[PDB]
Homo-oligomer: A and B are copies of this chain.
Amino acid sequence: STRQRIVAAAKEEFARHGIAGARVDRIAKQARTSKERVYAYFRSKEALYAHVAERETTALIEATQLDPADLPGYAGILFDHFAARPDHYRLITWGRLELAPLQATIAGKLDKLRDAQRIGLLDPAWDPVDVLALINQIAMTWAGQPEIAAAAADQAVDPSVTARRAALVTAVEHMFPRP
C-alpha cells in the first residue's frame, strides 16, 4: 500500500534523525512517493511522527500483555521486542527529548499489580508504581547502555544475545521471585 510505505519509511527516518532532523524529502523519496502525497495523509512532519509513535506504542502494548504472576517472563517479553525493533527504542527516545492513551494501559497495569499483591502473588510491601517502572527499565538495559553494550563485545564470557536475556530474566526473578 501507500500509507504503509510512507509509515515504514517514516519509522526508519525518525529513528535516525528524530523529528527536527527528519526530512519529508527523504521519507517520500524512500516510500516511493511525493511530498504532496505524504501531506495528503498527514498534516505535518509532526503529525506524521505522532501517527508513527501511536502505531508503535499500540504494536508494543499488544505484544506486551502483562502477566503479574510471571514478571521475569514479562521482562523477557520486552527484551525480545526491543531486541527485534532497535529503532522503536530510538524513535520513542527522540520523542521524550524533543517533545517532553499510554497512561491508560499503565493505570491498568498498576491495577493488575495491585491485584497480584491482594491475591498474594507479589510482596505487598512494593509500590506497584516502583515495580512497573523498574521492570520496564531493566528490560531496556542493552538499548539504554550502548557504551557497556560496546564493551560487552568480547568482554562477555558468552557473547550470545540470549545470555543477556538470561541474566536479565534471572535478575527480575531475584527481585520479585515467582510463586
A residues bordering B, Cβ < 8 Å?
Answer: 18, 20-21, 90, 93-94, 96-97, 100, 102-103, 106-107, 110, 126-130, 132-134, 136-138, 140-142, 144-152, 155-158, 163-164, 167-168, 171, 174-176
The reply to whether B137 and A167 form a contact with Cβ atoms under 8 Å apart is no
Q: Please give the distance in Å from A106's CB to the nearest CB on chain B.
A: 5
A145 to B142, CA, bound (A): 15
The closest CB in chain B to the CB of A107 belongs to B151
A20 to B132, CA, bound (A): 34
Q: Please give the distance in Å from A108's CB to the nearest CB on chain B.
A: 11
A156 to B94, CA, bound (A): 27
The reply to whether A133 and B110 form a contact with Cβ atoms under 8 Å apart is no
User: Which residues of chain B come closer than 8 Å to A155, judged between CB atoms?
Assistant: 107, 110, 128-129
Residue of A94, A102, A134 ringed by the most chain B CB atoms within 10 A: A134
User: Which residues of chain B come closer than 8 Å to A100, judged between CB atoms?
Assistant: 146
User: Which residues of chain B come closer than 8 Å to A94, judged between CB atoms?
Assistant: 97
A145 to B140, CA, bound (A): 10
User: Which residues of chain B come closer than 8 Å to A150, judged between CB atoms?
Assistant: 103
A7 to B174, CA, bound (A): 43
The reply to whether B140 and A133 form a contact with Cβ atoms under 8 Å apart is no
The reply to whether A127 and B93 form a contact with Cβ atoms under 8 Å apart is no
User: Which residues of chain B come closer than 8 Å to A158, judged between CB atoms?
Assistant: 127
Given contacts A156-B127, A156-B129, A164-B130, contact A106 B174 (CB under 8 A): no
The reply to whether A106 and B147 form a contact with Cβ atoms under 8 Å apart is yes
User: Which residues of chain B come closer than 8 Å to A171, judged between CB atoms?
Assistant: 130, 134, 175
User: Which residues of chain B come closer than 8 Å to A21, judged between CB atoms?
Assistant: 20
The reply to whether B97 and A130 form a contact with Cβ atoms under 8 Å apart is no
A171 to B138, CA, bound (A): 11
